[PDB]
Amino acid sequence: KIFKPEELRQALMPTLEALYRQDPESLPFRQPVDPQLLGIPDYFDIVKNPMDLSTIKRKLDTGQYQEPWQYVDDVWLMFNNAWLYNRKTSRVYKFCSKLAEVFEQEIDPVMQSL
Ligand SMILES: COc1ccc(N2C(=O)CCC[C@H]2c2nc3cc(-c4c(C)noc4C)ccc3n2[C@@H]2CCN(S(C)(=O)=O)C2)cc1Cl
């Protein structure tokens, strides 16, 4: 099945909207991690392929995803990076987990019906 970008946007955008609707949980994920601003010079030692909601949104908006799995991969990349870098005791890690739960719940029926 070849998907039109507009069909992908239509189908997938609500799952991204669900992530943004999580407040305050999505707030650390809405822009790329800035290690200079945050004083964390080892961030890019640990995280080689950064990802965040703004990047995912731009890619969906501009039709960069050919297939739904590619979107799903970038969402999980974002989550995996945050789980890798941050300690499980941290607020950011727990918020990562909350967003991943919401994502799993929302993406499931969407993938089925694609
Ligand atoms: C709304 O939730 C938060 C709001 C602020 C915090 N923060 C603190 O509690 C301590 C001060 C720094 C701040 C904060 N920590 C961030 C961590 C990340 C991040 C992620 C994701 N993956 O690895 C790292 C590292 C990202 C942002 C963090 N911030 C603030 C939240 C919003 N900003 S910003 C100004 O760059 O857009 C920085 C953390 C959380 Cl979970």
UniProtKB/Swiss-Prot annotation:
Q: What is the effect of changing K88E?
A: Impairs binding to acetylated histones
Compartments it resides in: Cytoplasm; Nucleus
Q: Where is the Bromo domain?
A: 3-110
Q: How is it modified after translation?
A: Methylation of the KIX domain by CARM1 blocks association with CREB. This results in the blockade of CREB signaling, and in activation of apoptotic response.
Q: Where is this region: Interaction with ASF1A?
A: 80-98
Q: How does it assemble?
A: Found in a complex containing NCOA2; NCOA3; IKKA; IKKB and IKBKG. Probably part of a complex with HIF1A and EP300. Interacts with GATA1; the interaction results in acetylation and enhancement of transcriptional activity of GATA1. Interacts with MAF and ZCCHC12. Interacts with DAXX; the interaction is dependent on CBP sumoylation and results in suppression of the transcriptional activity via recruitment of HDAC2 to DAXX. Interacts with phosphorylated CREB1. Interacts with CITED4 (C-terminal region). Interacts (via the TAZ-type 1 domain) with HIF1A.
Briefly state the protein's biological role: Acetylates histones, giving a specific tag for transcriptional activation. Mediates acetylation of histone H3 at 'Lys-18' and 'Lys-27' (H3K18ac and H3K27ac, respectively). Also acetylates non-histone proteins, like DDX21, FBL, IRF2, MAFG, NCOA3, POLR1E/PAF53 and FOXO1. Binds specifically to phosphorylated CREB and enhances its transcriptional activity toward cAMP-responsive genes. Acts as a coactivator of ALX1. Acts as a circadian transcriptional coactivator which enhances the activity of the circadian transcriptional activators: NPAS2-BMAL1 and CLOCK-BMAL1 heterodimers.
Query: What disease involvement is noted?
Result: Chromosomal aberrations involving CREBBP may be a cause of acute myeloid leukemias. Translocation t(8;16)(p11;p13) with KAT6A; translocation t(11;16)(q23;p13.3) with KMT2A/MLL1; translocation t(10;16)(q22;p13) with KAT6B. KAT6A-CREBBP may induce leukemia by inhibiting RUNX1-mediated transcription. Rubinstein-Taybi syndrome 1: A disorder characterized by craniofacial abnormalities, postnatal growth deficiency, broad thumbs, broad big toes, intellectual disability and a propensity for development of malignancies.
Regarding domains, what does the record say? The KIX domain mediates binding to HIV-1 Tat.
Any idea what this protein is called? CREB-binding protein
What part of the full protein is here? Answer: 1083 to 1196 of 2442
